[PDB]
């Protein structure tokens, strides 16, 4: 009933999707063998949203794994919860991308996209009434941003009314990992804005800061960073799988958060997060949930939310709490801090309540906010691109595969167009 | 004293006949082996053997042995007469010319001899009930041949045909529009009453009322059997307003060429959602006129009504029917033809319907079955006419027919008869 | 210088739960529209 | 994994009656016994999970 | 009653027939010694179709083995299930044809065929009520391609009203094993189209592709290919040998599949087929069975359905299932792929339901399709034929045994006429 199909691509996307199915299965009580072993009945009413039933009584997720190199998928199949995935859903190349956007979108991706698009269609027609797609990928690589944006563009043609979700791990200057990040990142934004309906940017810089300072663990790893993304992603669609006071699926979030069609880039956050040695001293109440919710350091992005004005924010409350107290906190924040909220839209905060909290927790909140402060991330990416593009450095590989510098100029202008248009609503007055 | 003979031809006719005889045995309590453990209502369908068992008054006819051998090896082996199960060796294989000119000629002699051996035993014979699916080889081939022979051998005996016409948009065979029209020419002037029983309507009935998303043919056949029992229920059961078979064509046929009618049935509910509604006579009669509840895929709102013969079995009270019927006439969405002021022939019976153990239906105090003649039935003849013209325009699948002994020009007369029939419906429907 | 699958994988294993027919033919497994009556009344005529 | 965590709202609509009709406490004792009720409310969490 | 006799010629035909008899014996519960040890009544219900009862209570197949070389004959005699056949039915020559159609159709075939025609007449007069003939042969090998078609001509001459089936393996371009192959392929086709009531074409390359992709077998072999062909062959007579809701026989299939007298070349396929690894991840349902059925990769032929339009198609379903589901699936696929279906015949799909699934499976499907895409094989064969015939290469072997170039010209003209008239209806519109 209103199912959603999940597609993960690239090295980073597979790692994000590897831990996502670990969290969901534990929430629904599914072992590595796919046999239900839960305790409460509520875990089975809407289990078909994410899982398909197979003959013999085991549940197989509707997940599609795609890459140009078999290195990462051979690692994910041998790990725990790696037997759930249908063996026919693995699609791979044999050449790799090498952080070359043209290779993953024009030369190599163009000849493999036909095979993966077929299995995408097969899962979609299997569902009774499709709700939409959710994609996990990274914008700093070839195979990630190459076929990732290609696949969304193709999917939009055959499903023009279904929704689309993307969780983009975009690069940050402080945590540098590739010398050609600005090139392929600004190219993907050009094509991503035209097709996707919901995009939620994530920076490794923010995840490293929240682990070291908030969670206060000495030696973090990619497993811990992937864990924080999994909890936030599952909290977005939690109300679609469990009963609650106010139901709000992904379509309802898009309507209330998107004032204009080109402004669909959000930044997310999850609460509560506490250290291992200080969880006894805190109190789990709505007032303390919301104060950490609005913390600038709790966001999953390098952008500082106090440098701009919020356009519209969404809060998904999990657990049992009084509805009056939830709204009273929301109204109180908007009044005491009138300088940080856009004024020509009255009551620009959305509240949703669901009855089922995450396993091992009493209360939780997932925060999604469309804020004008996100322009800073596009500003810094633009500076690095134009500085390096002026000397035409590292360019002949992008132009050596049938692509021309004309597309480069168009992409930077369009991303410049987005930044200027995105800012001018911050200065707008009634 | 009153008897009817049942003729089963083709797989479609046989596979619904055995379902009907399952229902008839339950009504009279006759065990499957034929004996009765512990008044003569059964006489209309069965005949006493002299000591013990009762045998059905029906003859099974087919050219393929697959279905007949299923009955002979089934648990109903001991019920039917061993030599009343006539079977051939070679199938007709969707070819009308094979069943009407090549193989059906050598079998029709055997069947008529048995029917003669069955009519002399009967003394107050009422008529014939023949079951056949039109869109088939032996169903249309032999069915046409038996109708032609019976009409001259017996004459004035009323013959009732319960035909299953092909569905509008879904079908099993690919060439059935060809042999559907060919048999249409034969049955027009040789059967008294024909009933439309396509499969699309019955699929929708199971999906909405009984909530059967994936029904098999047996569910369809059980529902058909209930209608047949209701139609005959006034013959073998005492009632307040009894109706005989001869009292159908006198009250349902305006003109001799206009004798095609479609049926409806109500209530059709499961045994768990029956607790939540009272099944009053006022609402069961309203569900009968629901266009989605017609047994034929036709929308009656597209045409007038000529007459309606609708029967209640159970504990209905005569005053209740008049109150319900008066409301129908006051309704505007249901309109009758101008030259027929009264159009309801209503009968009341004291025999509530029975239910087979393990069946889908639930047992209730009231049920209504309808046989209605309306001008809206002109659509179905047109839609098969459209399909036939598309294929015949390039003579597709014709070499199979001309090579079996049938003239090429026979398709002209078959097509021109349907156009003549359409001209009658459009002519009678206009006002005066 | 080939496991047991040598064309025998067209029909292999297929434990008893797999082979049994579908899950429902000509019957409704929905709670509200099912056919079974409760224990209290194994047979009663359904009207007024 | 807790079983009590899965209880949800909209189940709060009518559900029997904890106190039966034949053992209604008088008004006098309800006033008198508020000392333990307040005492039980305050320290219920302190002796169960705080230890 | 309505039984059929089996005759096989050539090495490939003999292998196909041996594996087919093994499959049929396994399905009917007949041990290799010819004794009945079945477990169900329906196993023995209709055993008369394929077998004869002799004194002592053992069953022998009514199969007639013909050849010009005793090597494969001795191999199949010494192989498993080689004791079922009656020793008299073995008829063979002592010289061989040497892959020469002229040698197999004029020199040794004419003098040898008297005895095999005598035994064929014996079987046909011994059977109660003949239903038809089915023949397994190949169009590449000289002896099969010639003697089989000469015997088809004689059998059609002597029994006019019966049905004739031929399961023929036509040449493939990529997998070639003979150099004079197009010549005798065209010569076989010219005679076959005139007399054969039905023709079914198989491709070794198509079987290799199926077994490597769908089945994911590392080392396929002729045993596996013959097993696939045998299953697809038994699927046709399943409904004749077992009860069902909508029973259908060979004449029914012929009438419902052949619109015009010379358009009787079909392609077949079998479903379901899954690898051992993905065996437990699949769910057997009518929708997925129809999806695999209409998948082009499941066809036993290299011809691509997307290169033509279907005239008529048939689907024989085995197992207990609902009729409404099958009908709705057929209507849905016909409406979804309306551009791929010819438009002047409505509802060009025939469905049959049988109540006995194959041993080991709850459900199975056999597909027979008459599509305009089959002209490609004849186009390629005729191209090779004319390329070799323009130089008169290898022609002296055929001209030195009674034939002349006018027969080759007539065969080429007939093949071209078949191709042109078969393509006409593809673009013919109403
Ligand atoms: N309602 C209903 N219709 C059936 C049933 N079986 C077959 N039919 C109808 O019969 C038509 C095809 O003819 P068949 O009954 O299969 O075969 P036949 O009538 O014996 O004629 P032949 O082809 O010569 O065997 C189909 O289009 C169905 O509509 C059934 O069990 N119930
Ligand atoms: N959160 C997270 N990020 C990762 C992981 N692996 C790689 N990344 C990020 O992905 C970026 C490099 O992406 P890349 O591997 O080139 O993407 P690809 O081209 O799709 O393979 C780096 O900046 C990393 O921060 C992971 O396991 N978890
Ligand atoms: N499927 C299948 N094809 C075979 C087999 N043996 C031979 N063939 C095919 O038959 C063709 C050669 O035919 P040939 O044996 O000369 O026919 P013959 O001269 O009548 O015996 C080759 O192209 C092979 O692909 C077999 O066991 N199975
Ligand atoms: Mg039949």
TrEMBL record, chain C:
Subcellular location: Cytoplasm, Cytoskeleton
Protein name according to UniProt: EFHB C-terminal EF-hand domain-containing protein
Whole sequence portion shown: 265 to 317 of 422
TrEMBL record, chain D:
Signal peptide extent: none
Compartments, as annotated in UniProt: Cell projection, Cilium; Cytoplasm, Cytoskeleton
Family according to the record: Belongs to the PIERCE1 family.
Protein name: Uncharacterized protein
Native organism: Tetrahymena thermophila (strain SB210)
Residues of the full protein shown: 15 to 65 of 173
């Amino acid at each position: 009933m209103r199912e959603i199909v999940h597609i993960q691509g690239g090295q980073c996307g597979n790692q994000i999707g590897a831990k996502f199915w670990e969290v969901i299965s534990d929430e629904h009580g599914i072992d590595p063998t796919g046999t239900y072993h839960g305790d409460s009945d509520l875990q089975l009413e809407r289990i078909n949203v994410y899982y398909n039933e197979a003959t013999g009584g085991r549940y197989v997720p509707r997940a599609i794994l795609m890459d140009l190199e078999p290195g990462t998928m051979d690692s994910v199949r041998a790990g725990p919860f790696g037997q759930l995935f249908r063996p026919d859903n693995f699609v791979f190349g044999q050449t790799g991308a090498g952080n070359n956007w043209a290779k993953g979108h024009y030369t190599e991706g163009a000849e493999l996209i036909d095979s993966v698009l077929d299995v995408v269609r097969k899962e979609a027609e299997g569902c009774d009434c499709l709700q939409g797609f959710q994609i996990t990928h990274s914008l700093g690589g070839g195979t990630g941003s190459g076929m990732g944006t290609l696949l969304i563009s193709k999917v939009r043609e055959e499903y023009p009314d279904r929704i689309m979700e993307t969780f983009s791990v975009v690069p940050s200057p402080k945590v540098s990992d590739t010398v050609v990040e600005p090139y392929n990142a600004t190219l993907s934004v050009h094509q991503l804005v035209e097709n996707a309906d919901e995009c939620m940017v994530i920076d490794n810089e923010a995840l490293y800061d929240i682990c070291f300072r908030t969670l206060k663990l000495t030696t973090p790893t990619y497993g811990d960073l992937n864990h924080l993304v999994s909890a936030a992603m599952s909290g977005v669609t939690c109300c679609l799988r469990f009963p609650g006071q106010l139901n709000s699926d992904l379509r309802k979030l898009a309507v209330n958060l998107i004032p204009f069609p080109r402004l669909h880039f959000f930044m997310i956050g999850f609460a509560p997060l506490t250290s291992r040695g200080s969880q006894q001293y805190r109190a789990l109440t709505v007032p303390e949930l919301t104060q950490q919710m609005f913390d600038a350091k709790n966001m999953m992005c390098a952008a500082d939310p106090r440098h701009g004005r919020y356009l519209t924010a969404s809060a998904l409350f999990r657990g049992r709490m009084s509805t009056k107290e939830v709204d009273e906190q929301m109204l109180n924040v908007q009044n005491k801090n009138s300088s940080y909220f856009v004024e020509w839209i009255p009551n620009n905060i959305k509240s949703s309540i669901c009855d089922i909290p995450p396993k091992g927790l009493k209360m939780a909140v997932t925060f999604v906010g469309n804020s004008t402060a996100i322009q800073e991330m596009f500003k810094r990416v633009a500076e690095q691109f134009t500085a390096m593009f002026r000397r035409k450095a590292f360019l002949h590989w992008y132009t050596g595969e049938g692509m021309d510098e004309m597309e480069f100029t168009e992409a930077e202008s369009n991303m410049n167009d987005l930044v200027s248009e995105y800012q001018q609503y911050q200065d707008a007055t009634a | 004293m009153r008897e009817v003979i049942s003729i089963h031809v083709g797989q479609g006719g046989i596979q619904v006949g055995n379902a009907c005889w399952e229902l008839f045995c339950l009504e009279h309590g006759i065990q499957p082996d034929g004996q009765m453990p512990s008044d003569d209502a059964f006489n209309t369908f069965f005949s006493e053997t002299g000591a013990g068992k009762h045998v059905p008054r029906a003859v099974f006819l087919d050219l393929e042995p697959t279905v007949i051998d299923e009955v002979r090896t089934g648990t109903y082996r001991q019920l039917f007469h061993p030599e009343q199960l006539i079977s051939g060796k070679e199938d007709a294989a969707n070819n009308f010319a094979r069943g009407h000119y090549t193989i059906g000629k050598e079998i029709v002699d055997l069947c008529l001899d048995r029917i003669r051996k069955l009519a002399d035993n009967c003394t107050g014979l009422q008529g014939f009930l023949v079951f056949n699916s039109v869109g088939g080889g032996t169903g249309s081939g032999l069915g046409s041949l038996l109708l032609e022979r019976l009409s001259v051998d017996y004459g004035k005996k009323s013959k009732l045909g319960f035909t299953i016409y092909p569905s509008p948009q879904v079908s099993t065979a690919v060439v059935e529009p060809y042999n559907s029209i060919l048999s249409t020419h034969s049955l027009l002037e040789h059967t008294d009453v024909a009933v439309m029983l396509d499969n699309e309507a019955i699929y929708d009935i199971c999906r909405r009322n009984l909530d059967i998303e994936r029904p098999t043919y047996t569910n369809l056949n059980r529902l058909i059997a209930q209608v047949i029992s209701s139609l005959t229920a006034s013959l073998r059961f005492d009632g307040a307003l009894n109706v005989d078979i001869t009292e159908f064509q006198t009250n349902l046929v305006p003109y001799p060429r206009i004798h095609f009618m479609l049926s409806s049935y109500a209530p059709i509910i499961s045994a768990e959602k029956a607790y939540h509604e009272q099944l009053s006579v006022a609402e069961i009669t309203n569900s009968a006129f629901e266009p989605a509840n017609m047994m034929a895929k036709c929308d009656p709102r597209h045409g007038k009504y000529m007459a309606c013969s609708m029967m209640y079995r159970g504990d209905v009270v005569p005053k209740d029917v008049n109150a319900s019927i008066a409301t129908i006439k006051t309704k505007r969405t249901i309109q009758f033809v101008d030259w027929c002021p009264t159009g309801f022939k209503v009968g009341i019976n004291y025999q509530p319907p029975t239910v087979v153990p393990g069946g889908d239906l639930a047992k209730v105090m009231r049920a209504v079955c309808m046989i209605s003649n309306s001008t809206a039935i002109a659509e179905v003849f047109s839609r098969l006419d459209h399909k036939f013209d598309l294929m015949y325009a390039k003579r597709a699948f014709v070499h199979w027919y001309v090579g079996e002994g049938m003239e090429e020009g026979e398709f002209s007369e078959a097509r021109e008869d349907l156009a003549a029939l359409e001209k009658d419906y459009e002519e009678v429907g206009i006002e005066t | 210088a080939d496991e047991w699958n040598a064309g025998k994988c067209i029909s292999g294993e297929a434990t008893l739960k797999e082979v049994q027919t579908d899950k429902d033919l000509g019957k409704t497994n929905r709670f509200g529209f099912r056919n079974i009556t409760k224990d209290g009344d194994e047979n009663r005529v359904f009207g007024v | 994994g807790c079983k009590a965590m899965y209880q949800t709202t909209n189940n709060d609509y009518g559900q029997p009656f904890l106190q039966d009709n034949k053992t209604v406490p008088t008004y006098n004792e309800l006033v008198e016994a508020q000392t333990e009720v307040t005492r039980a409310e305050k320290q219920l969490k302190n002796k169960t999970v705080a230890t």
